[PDB]
């Protein structure tokens, strides 16, 4: 199910990285992926307001959320 | 299908938020900012559809296909995973190939009577099959499969000698596999990768030698057929092992990959000389599609110590010995978007313009034809049931489905 | 010359560009100097753009022979 | 961006083959031996100009008639660019002191000016008195 | 020390071998052979304009074509690994004086510290296993023998029928005679069956030498050829000395007065030895079938034909390791003989025959005239022989020995330093059985190709390879050799039978590939060894039949070398620079004359039908029959000239004979 | 005479090529010539030169080849 979105989160966009996100516990490694894509200048969508040019972005679905049909 | 809020998806489909793929919850929704970029490219291909029959058939035995079958049934079967199944197979292989007294009895069921192998004369009174029943009398498998394959082995070495007489055929269906997922499945794939050579060494080498010892024309052979067969078969079992641990080898190569992926410090783990780009692992640098394996790797487990690390190794051999290159499985392999090339997409929506309705989906089948059958069985044993379609209904019911494909044009249906 | 840049302060900037800054091609010189044509005359010929019609098959066109490159 | 850029040519081995066989870009490569560079030294109210006949700078004797240097390229463009760019330099700086404007800058540039020349000064000795122009001063 | 007894040449034993005739007594009395080979008929080795042809050749070309083997000794680039200056010798005049072969390198084996037996007793078992299998299943087939092959020691008869009587009587009472030797009646069988006897020193001649140009002054230094004297010999490496023979040609500008062009020293005088056949009959009669065996039961490490034959086996490999072997013959252990005879008997092999081996395997020798005013020294005492002279050439099964211990120490070392944990599947002698079978079946990560000393190695995905890299590294350093039986280095500039494996930038077994050496072709042209003795009606006696063949076969041959045609350029060019003519048309016509000469020699290839019957390999065997005596195995030849070269021997006599020799 | 012999050599080369099978390989010496640096490279007229030369590849080789064994 997770394997789903990521793949077509590849196309749109090859934007990547992200960091290991150790938080406070615990650094055994923890690094997913990020997607800057490119956007329209309005964001009533996504808690990550980061409209600036484009969302960066923490989660794959938002790319699609900002994606064209 | 279901629905969820976008801003609140972590409060909604919280597991689905990928941050969940990591143990992250926190005050914080993962993320932040950092470093090293490379689109992770070239994903393993499309195992969906492509259903078809395959033939076990000949005793000439292709380990490769059989492996594919093992993963196949394994996911499809009554016993996960492939791993334990391979263990059980090795057990059976001991109980059979490494258990010589059986073979005496087998030759006994073949030409066996007295003063074997009844000099130079032929006489191969056997269906392949009858052997199979005799072995069925022996140790049962929950999952015979290989129980056929062992017979196939009996054929392969008895093929040079006049016992090609039985030759019938054996058939089995596929089974659809997903995206495809979990690294444990990869573990299955790597132990199966061993099976490729855990098995073939007995599937091969074998003997062209002895016809049947020749000794013109060849040959007398008491237990000597069973002798030469099994003792070599056991010997073949010895060279087989695969040595290298299943979960370990993937754990390590995944370790080197993920820490290669690391923007935060690689530290002692690092890109290096022959530590990396060994004319293949760099191709994995290009195969970074198997990302997520690192994700659950820390999640399913935790620290990914390379433990059999070494530094020459590996490098050296182990990444070389990675599964996809040994190509079992619906492990599949491909460039980028073709796996995505079955993704629907409809922004729909308006004025805002972005949000209230943006759907996705997939294009799909309706080859209407569907079939049914009697389960004829020439002899009781398991489920080797012959079946013939029942066209008289089978066609018309399919015909009944014919408009229905024009109905529910799912793409058009999305428009709804 | 890069070092010259800080000379001379202070910032303009709109009133007068900008500058060529950029070309100083070894290549264009050598291509013509190889025939000892002296490229430097061709240079101004690209300043005004138009060729000054030094009508000779090994004169005029050779200038243009450079301009293309 | 700052160039990657590595290209730099090389003279062809020539003699190793024309020890056997003729080449044909010749003529082109020309004659070719300048120069009589006389120079004066105006020690107080007197001239004392001196000059020298190229070949013995090499210490060879005597005059050679028919030695044939090529006409090496590349470098011409560099040194020319160097020359002309100095022209851009001193023109700009001199104009700057002519008005800009505002003292803090003028000394800067006229200060700047100095070491620019000073810089060239230094490198010019490397051009000469270190092989083989020491023969020239000699 | 203990001198191997230095009987005078004159001795009745010296007589009993020889037919006491022309060549017999002459060979007893033989002076030092010397003489420019007619390097081409109508063309000795000595022609000065051709010498200048060498001059231009090696100079101008090595100039143009420096070697391309990398640090690892693995190869790239042009694929050259060799000075072309190895041409530059008196290739018709040997570099003189000569070595005196020992009687025991056992201390020399204790200097290289080569082991007196097993490392691990496990290793012992391994030895016992290779022995177990080399002494295993057998499918006897008729023996065969070279036509025109002199009986050498003993009689030196050229007649085949002599060899017939000898071998057949041997078939009749090798039991009785090997018993006599067990009974110690050496000379009785030696003078009735005339079995066994002695070796006679002869020469291999290294056509080349490691001539090295000096950038600072042009010196052309061939590798020095350190050699034993009679005392270093009899005192098994104890007394005596190790020393270069004179390389000089001015000593013939001296003696012969012959002019001495630069860099042209004299070919190395390697020394083979001939010996009695009656025991070599059982040797071929089994081993040749054993040859067929491993080539059938295994091949793999063993089959030897096309570079393709090998390469296909190779590019497979993730890792590959060409071998490099120290003095291949002398080093063979006698305790190895001990285990041999051991398990021979253990597995029912005939004790008299076993005695026959040990007789030959320590058989007394003889030195002719190693220098003028040298030799004619009978050696050993065919009454109590005890020689540990190493692998004497008279045996043809020596190759089995080389391939043996080499493969041993190889695989073993692979255990030692790459797969020790894997030795766990080597639980015992039977485990060694399934295994060794499988390894020569190749179902293993650690791997090899093998042929006597020459060999290579292979590796893959699977839990063993990184240690292969390690052992690789150590051996590449060569700083210390783990092998206690051999000084086995890597060969920088490694190759296998002239199959120079090439590597690309990736430097992989799957990378670049074998090539037939073209410099080796040059050798074939100009730096081989023998003359023909044209003064005989039949070329069957002649050392070197039809060189023109190789000419035509060249692309088909060493055109495997990529740069091939450029070599053609150079050769034809330099010849026009030499005799100023067409070595092209020259050699073509030589080929034509080869066809002419062979034409009457051949029947079924009706008249001058064309050369279609002969394989390009067999073509290589027809320009070069000679290596068939130390490269090609007999079966390789197409049956036509095969029979022109060889003659059959009865399957039956040999059959029952083996039935005696074999544990049944 | 040619203003530009070049081929004037080449025609001789042709004489050699067919006289090569016959005993007139005797003369064989050698002939050498330098390169010349070319630019970016430029104008389509130069390409015109390149295509007629492209013909020369086969305008010439047909006489350079076939020939006679
Ligand atoms: Mn080789």
- DSSP string covering D4-60, please? ----------THHHHTTS--SS-SSS---------B----TT----B---GGGGTT-
Q: Is E538 annotated as a binding residue?
A: no
Q: At what angle do helices E351-360 and E334-346 cross, to 10 degrees?
A: 170
Nearest to B310 among E435, E462, E466 (CB): E466
- Distance in Å, alpha carbon of C20 to nearest chain D alpha carbon: 12
Report CB contact under 8 Å: F39, C30.
no
Give the helix ranges, DSSP H, for B220-367.
224-239, 246-260, 281-285, 293-296, 323-326
**Helices (H), strands (E): how many in chain D?**
4, 0
The two tokens of residue E342 are 């051991």
Decide if F30 touches E, using CB distance below 8 A: no
Contact yes or no for C65 and F40 at CB 8 A: no
Q: What distance, in Å, lies between the first and last C-alpha atoms of chain E? A: 42
Give the C-alpha separation, B409 to B366, whole Å: 9
Q: Collect all residues of chain F within an 8 Å Cβ-Cβ radius of residue E576.
A: 25, 28
Method in brief: cryo-EM
Tell me which residue of E493, E435, E444, E487 sits closest to E468, measured CA to CA: E444
**F34 → closest Cβ in D20, D23, D73:** D23
CA distance E577 to chain F (A): 10
Question: E4, E387 in Cβ contact below 8 A?
Answer: yes
Instruction: Tell me the C-alpha distance between C22 and C19, whole Å.
Output: 8
Phi-psi region of B400 (alpha: psi -120 to 50; beta: other; left: phi over 0): alpha
Chains C and F share 3 or more Cβ pairs within 8 Å: yes
Closest to B24 (Cα-Cα) out of A20, A55, A61, A50: A20
Query: What does the buried/exposed string (b/e) look like for D110-125 if buried means 16 or more CB atoms within 10 Å of the residue's CB?
Result: eebbeebeeeeeeeee
Distance E457 CA to ligand 1 centre (A): 13
Judging by DSSP bridges, how do beta strands E454-459 and E447-451 pair with one another? antiparallel
Q: Are E156 and E22 in contact (CB under 8 A)?
A: no
Cα E576 to Cα E582: distance, rounded to the nearest angstrom: 6
Domains in chain E (CATH in brackets) are 1-30+102-276+333-397 (no CATH), 37-91+518-606 (1.10.490.60), 277-332+398-517 (3.30.70.1600), 607-664 (6.20.410.10)
What is the distance in angstroms between the Cα of D81 and the nearest Cα belonging to chain F?
A: 19
Q: Do chains A and E touch (3 or more CB pairs under 8 A)?
A: no
Angle between helices E519-526 and E547-558 (to 10 degrees): 180
Query: Checking DSSP bridges between strand E204-206 and strand E265-270, what pairing results, if any?
Result: antiparallel
Q: Helix, strand, or coil here: E125? A: helix
Task: Collect all residues with Cβ–Cβ distance below 8 Å to B187 and sequence separation of at least 6.
Answer: B81, B83, B246, B247, B250
CA E515–ligand 1 middle distance (angstroms):
9
DSSP structure string for E175-201 = HHHHHHHHTT-HHHHTTTT------EE
> Rounded distance, CA D133 to CA D115, Å?
24
CA of E326 to the centre of ligand 1 (A): 16
Note whether B209 contacts E: Cβ–Cβ < 8 A.
Answer: yes
What chains are in contact with E, requiring at least 3 Cβ pairs below 8 Å? Answer: B, F
Q: Is E214 annotated as a binding residue?
A: no
Q: Closest chain C residue to F36 measured between Cα atoms?
A: C34
Task: Among F25, F28, F30, pick the best mutation site for testing chain E contact (most E Cβ within 10 A).
Answer: F25
The rounded distance, in Å, linking the Cα atoms of E116 and E134 is 21
Terminus-to-terminus CA distance in chain B, angstroms? 14
Residues of chain D with C-beta less than 8 angstroms from the C-beta of F36: 25
**Mode of pairing for the β-strands spanning E144-146 and E646-648:** antiparallel
User: Structure tokens of B310?
Assistant: 């070494």
CB proximity B173 to E under 8 Å: no
User: What count of Cα atoms within 13 Å lies in the side-chain half-sphere of residue B216?
Assistant: 1
Please tell me the distance between residue E284's alpha carbon and the centre of ligand 1 in angstroms: 25
Integer angstrom CA distances of residue E172 from E156, E166, E178, E396, E658: 22, 10, 12, 22, 11
E543 Cβ neighbours under 8 A, 6+ residues apart = E529, E530, E531, E532, E533, E626
Element (H, E) at E647: strand E646-648
User: Do residue D12 and residue F29 have CB atoms under 8 angstroms apart?
Assistant: no
Q: Give chains near F: 3+ CB pairs under 8 A.
A: C, D, E
Tokens found for residue E560: 């495997």
Q: Residue E471's closest chain B neighbor by CA?
A: B312
d(CA E209, CA E84): 10
Residue B219 C-alpha to ligand 1 middle, in angstroms? 41
From A6, A7, A40, residue closest to B354, measured CB to CB: A40
Task: Report which secondary-structure segment, H or E, holds B135.
Answer: helix B130-137
Q: Kindly list the distances between the CA atom of residue E176 and the CA atoms of B142, E173, E350, E382, E383, in Å, as whole numbers in the listed order.
A: 65, 5, 11, 17, 17
**B364 min Cα distance to partner chain E (Å):** 40
Q: Does E659 touch chain B (CB under 8 A)?
A: no
SS3 state at C17: strand
Helix or strand (DSSP H, E) at B386:
strand B386-389
**How many Cβ pairs closer than 8 A exist between chain A and B?**
151
Q: Name residue, tokens 């016809």.
A: B211
* Rounded Cα distance, E41 and E45, in Å: 10
Residues of D whose CB is below 8 A from F35 = 12
- Sign of the torsion angle spanned by Cα atoms A52, A54, A58, A61: positive
Determine how many CB atoms are found less than 10 A away from the CB of residue B39: 15
The DSSP secondary-structure symbol of B401 reads H
Residues of C with Cβ-Cβ distance to D105 under 8 angstroms: 7-9
Cβ neighbours of residue B170 closer than 8 Å, sequence gap 6 or more: B55, B56, B57, B148
Nearest in space to B318 (alpha carbons), one of B308, B331, B332: B308
Beta strands E89-94 and E265-270 are parallel
Residue E516, strand partner residues: E499
Q: How many residues does chain F have?
A: 69
CA of E456 to the centre of ligand 1 (A): 9
* Contact call for residues E246 and E167 (beta carbons, < 8 A): no
Up-side HSE of residue E359: CA atoms within 13 Å toward CB? 32
Give the CA distances from residue F59 to residues D21, E641, F62, F64, in Å, rounded to whole numbers and listed in that order.
28, 51, 7, 9
Structural tokens at position E481? 């050799």
Gap between the Cα atoms of B372 and B389, Å rounded: 5
Nearest to A21 among B16, B30, B348 (CB): B30
Q: Is E349 annotated as a binding residue?
A: no
Please, which chains are in contact with D (at least 3 CB pairs closer than 8 A)? C, F
Residues of chain C with C-beta less than 8 angstroms from the C-beta of D74: 26, 30
């Amino acid at each position: 199910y997770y394997a789903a979105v990521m793949h077509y989160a590849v196309a749109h966009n090859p934007e990547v990285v992200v960091s290991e996100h150790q938080g406070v516990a615990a650094e055994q490694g923890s690094l997913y992926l990020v997607w800057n894509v490119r956007t329209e200048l309005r964001i009533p969508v996504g808690y990550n307001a980061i409209e600036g040019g484009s969302i960066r972005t923490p989660e794959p679905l938002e790319a699609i959320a900002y994606n064209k049909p | 299908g279901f629905n969820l809020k976008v801003k609140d998806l972590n409060g909604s489909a919280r597991g689905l938020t990928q941050a969940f793929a990591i143990g992250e919850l926190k005050n914080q929704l993962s993320v932040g900012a950092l470093q090293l970029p490379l689109q992770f490219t070239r994903t393993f291909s499309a195992s969906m559809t492509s259903e078809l029959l395959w033939e076990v058939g000949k005793g000439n035995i292709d380990p490769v296909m059989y492996a594919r079958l093992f993963f196949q049934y394994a996911q499809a079967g009554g016993a996960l995973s492939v791993d334990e199944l391979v263990n059980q197979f090795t057990e059976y292989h001991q109980s059979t190939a490494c258990n010589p007294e059986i073979w005496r009895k087998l030759t006994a069921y073949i030409t066996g009577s007295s003063n074997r192998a009844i000099k130079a004369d032929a006489v191969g009174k056997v269906p392949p099959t009858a052997i199979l029943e005799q072995l069925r009398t022996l140790a049962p498998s929950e999952h015979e499969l290989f129980h056929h394959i062992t017979t196939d082995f009996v054929c392969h070495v008895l093929s040079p000698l006049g016992f090609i007489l039985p030759d019938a055929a054996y058939v089995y269906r596929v089974g659809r596999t997903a995206t495809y997922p979990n690294f444990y499945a990869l573990v299955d794939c790597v132990r199966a990768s061993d099976l490729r050579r855990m098995l073939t060494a007995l599937s091969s080498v074998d003997s062209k030698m002895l016809q049947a010892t020749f000794k013109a024309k060849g040959a007398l052979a008491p237990a000597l057929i069973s002798q030469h067969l099994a003792n070599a078969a056991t010997t073949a079992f010895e060279r087989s092992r695969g040595n290298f641990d299943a979960n370990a080898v993937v754990s390590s190569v995944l370790t080197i990959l993920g820490r290669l992926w690391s923007p935060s410090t690689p530290k002692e783990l690092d890109p290096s000389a022959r530590l990396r780009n060994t004319n293949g692992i760099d191709q994995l640098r290009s195969n970074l599609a198997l990302f997520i394996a690192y994700q659950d790797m820390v999640k399913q487990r935790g620290r990914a110590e390379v433990i059999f690390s070494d530094e020459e190794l590996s490098s050296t051999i182990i990444p070389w010995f990675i599964e996809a290159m040994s190509e079992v499985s619906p492990f599949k392999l491909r460039p980028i978007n073709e796996t995505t090339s079955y993704i629907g997409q409809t922004s729909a929506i308006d004025h805002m313009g972005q949000p209230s309705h943006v759907v996705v989906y997939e294009d799909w089948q309706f080859a209407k034809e569907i079939t049914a059958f009697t389960p004829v069985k020439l002899a009781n044993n398991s489920n080797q049931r012959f079946l013939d379609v029942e066209p008289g209904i089978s066609d018309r019911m399919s015909a009944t489905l014919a408009p229905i494909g024009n109905t529910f044009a799912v793409s058009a249906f999305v428009k709804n | 010359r890069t070092a010259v840049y800080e000379a001379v302060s202070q910032r303009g900037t709109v009133n007068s560009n900008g500058a060529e800054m950029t070309l100083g091609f070894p290549s264009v010189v050598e291509r013509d100097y190889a025939l000892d044509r002296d490229p430097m005359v061709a240079i101004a010929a690209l300043r005004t753009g138009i060729v000054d019609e030094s009508l000779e098959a090994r004169a005029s066109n050779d200038l243009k022979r450079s301009m293309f490159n | 961006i700052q160039p990657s850029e590595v290209l730099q040519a090389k003279v062809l081995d020539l003699a190793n083959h024309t020890t056997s066989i003729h080449i044909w870009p010749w003529h082109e490569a020309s004659t070719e031996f300048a120069y009589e560079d006389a120079y004066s030294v105006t020690i107080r109210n007197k001239r004392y100009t001196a000059e020298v006949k190229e070949f013995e700078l090499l210490g060879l004797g005597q005059r050679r008639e028919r030695v044939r240097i090529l006409k090496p390229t590349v470098a011409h463009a560099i040194i020319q660019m160097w020359y002309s760019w100095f022209v851009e330099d001193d023109r700009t700086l001199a104009a700057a002191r002519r008005t800009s404007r505002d003292d803090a800058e003028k000394l800067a540039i006229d200060g700047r000016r100095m070491q620019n020349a000073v810089t060239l000064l230094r490198k010019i000795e490397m051009i000469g008195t270190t092989g083989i122009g020491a023969s020239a001063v000699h | 020390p203990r001198r191997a007894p230095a009987f005078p040449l004159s001795d009745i034993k010296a007589q009993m071998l020889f037919a006491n005739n022309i060549k017999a007594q002459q060979a007893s009395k033989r002076s030092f052979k010397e003489g420019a080979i007619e390097t081409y008929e109508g063309l000795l080795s000595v022609d000065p304009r051709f010498l200048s042809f060498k001059n231009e050749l090696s100079r101008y070309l090595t100039d143009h074509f420096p070697a391309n083997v990398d640090e690892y000794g693995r190869v790239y680039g042009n694929g050259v690994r060799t000075n072309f200056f190895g041409m530059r010798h008196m290739n018709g005049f040997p570099m003189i004086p000569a070595t005196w072969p020992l009687a025991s390198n056992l201390k020399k084996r204790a200097d290289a510290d080569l082991a007196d037996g097993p490392v691990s007793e496990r290793d012992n078992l391994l030895f016992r296993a290779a022995v177990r299998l080399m002494f295993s299943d057998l499918e006897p087939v008729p023996l065969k023998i070279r036509k025109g092959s002199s009986t050498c020691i003993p009689y030196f008869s050229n007649d085949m029928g002599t060899k017939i009587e000898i071998a057949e009587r041997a078939l009749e009472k090798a039991e009785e005679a090997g018993n006599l030797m067990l009974q110690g009646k050496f000379d009785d069988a030696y003078q009735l069956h005339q079995m066994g006897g002695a070796y006679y020193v002869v020469y291999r001649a290294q056509s080349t030498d490691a001539i090295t140009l000096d950038p600072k002054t042009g010196k052309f230094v061939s590798k020095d050829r350190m050699v034993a004297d009679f005392e270093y010999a009899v005192t098994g490496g104890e007394q005596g000395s190790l020393f270069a023979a004179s390389k000089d040609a001015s000593r013939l500008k001296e003696q012969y007065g012959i002019d001495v062009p630069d860099g042209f020293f004299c070919e190395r005088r390697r020394t083979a030895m001939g010996g009695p056949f009656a025991l070599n009959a059982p040797i071929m009669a089994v081993a040749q079938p054993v040859r067929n065996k491993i080539y059938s039961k295994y091949a793999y490490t063993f089959h030897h034909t096309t570079r393709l034959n090998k390469e296909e086996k190779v590019k497979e490999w993730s890792l590959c390791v060409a071998t490099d072997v120290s003095d291949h013959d002398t080093f063979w252990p006698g305790w190895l003989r001990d285990l041999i005879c051991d398990e021979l008997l253990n597995m029912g092999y005939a004790p008299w025959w076993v005695k026959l081996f040990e007789t030959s395997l320590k058989l007394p020798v003889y030195v002719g005239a190693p220098a003028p005013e040298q030799g004619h020294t009978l050696l050993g005492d065919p009454s109590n022989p005890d020689l540990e002279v190493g692998l004497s050439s008279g045996q043809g099964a020596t190759d089995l020995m080389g391939t043996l211990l080499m493969s041993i120490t190889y695989l073993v070392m692979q255990l030692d330093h790459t797969a020790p944990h894997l030795n766990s599947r080597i639980k015992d002698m039977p485990s060694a059985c399934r295994f060794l079978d499988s390894y020569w079946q190749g179902h293993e990560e650690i791997r090899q190709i093998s042929k006597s000393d020459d060999a290579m190695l292979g590796w893959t995905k699977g839990r063993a390879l990184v240690g292969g890299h390690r052992l690789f590294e150590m051996l590449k350093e060569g700083k210390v050799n783990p092998s206690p039986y051999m000084k086995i280095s890597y060969e920088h500039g490694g190759a296998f039978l002239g199959d120079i494996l090439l590597y690309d930038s990736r430097r992989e077994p799957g990378s670049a590939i074998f090539v037939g050496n073209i410099n080796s072709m040059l050798n074939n042209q100009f730096s081989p060894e023998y003359g023909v003795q044209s003064g005989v009606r039949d070329r069957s006696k002649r050392k070197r039949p039809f060189p023109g063949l190789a000419w035509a076969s060249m692309k088909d041959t060493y055109g495997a070398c990529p740069i091939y045609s450029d070599v053609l350029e150079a050769i034809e060019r330099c010849w026009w620079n030499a005799f100023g003519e067409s070595y092209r048309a020259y050699r073509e016509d030589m080929l034509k004359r080869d066809t002419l000469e062979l034409s009457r020699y051949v029947a079924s290839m009706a008249r001058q039908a064309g050369l279609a019957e002969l394989t390009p390999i067999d073509l290589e065997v027809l320009a070069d029959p000679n290596k068939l005596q130390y490269k090609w195995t007999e079966a390789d030849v197409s049956a036509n000239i095969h029979e022109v070269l060889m003659h059959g021997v009865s399957v039956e006599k040999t059959e029952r004979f083996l039935r005696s020799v074999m544990p049944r």
